[PDB]
RNA sequence: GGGGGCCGGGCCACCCCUCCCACGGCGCGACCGCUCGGGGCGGACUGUCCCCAGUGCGCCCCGGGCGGGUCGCGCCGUCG
């Protein structure tokens, strides 16, 4: 340590961008999801009745 | 006493040609910024119609409606 304390930064290696976590859902998707849920609910009672 | 005046010049009045600028309108042309649809590819997600049905996103062409943006072009109007 007392001889060579200088830090040598790790050789930076470029890598292609990769997404590991889910992005935020869009309002249009959220509005559609509620619309789908309601429509499935009404059909569910329709088939049951 | 009362008058006309005395020679050139410049501008305007009229005719023809006619440059620039400003302002308004009408059209076009191209940038730039918005917007509603058609298709192609990828990618993600949703729904108790599920080998079913959707919804964003990235990207790729085509079409359409505009901005009281910007520039350029032409025409019209101004006792400019």
Question: Given in angstroms, what resolution was this structure solved at?
Answer: 2.6
Euclidean distance between the first and the last CA atom of chain A, given in angstroms as a whole number: 80
Positions of strand B less than 7 angstroms from a protein CB:
44-49, 53-57
C-alpha span between A49 and A46 (Å, rounded)? 5
Q: How was this structure determined?
A: cryo-EM
Beta carbons within 8 Å of A25's beta carbon, 6+ residues apart: A33
Å from the A37 CA to the B72 C1':
57
C-alpha span between A26 and A7 (Å, rounded)? 44
Sign of the dihedral defined by the CA atoms of residues A23, A29, A31, A36, in that order: negative
Å from the A29 CA to the B25 C1':
48
C-alpha span between A33 and A25 (Å, rounded)? 10
> Which tokens go with A17?
């961008």
Beta carbons within 8 Å of A33's beta carbon, 6+ residues apart: A25
Beta carbons within 8 Å of A12's beta carbon, 6+ residues apart: none
Å from the A33 CA to the B15 C1':
82
């Amino acid at each position: 340590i007392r001889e060579n304390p200088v830090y040598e930064k790790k050789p930076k290696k470029e890598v292609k961008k990769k997404r590991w976590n889910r992005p935020k859902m869009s309002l249009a998707q959220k509005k559609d999801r509620v619309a789908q849920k309601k429509a499935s609910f009404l059909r569910a009672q329709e088939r049951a009745a």
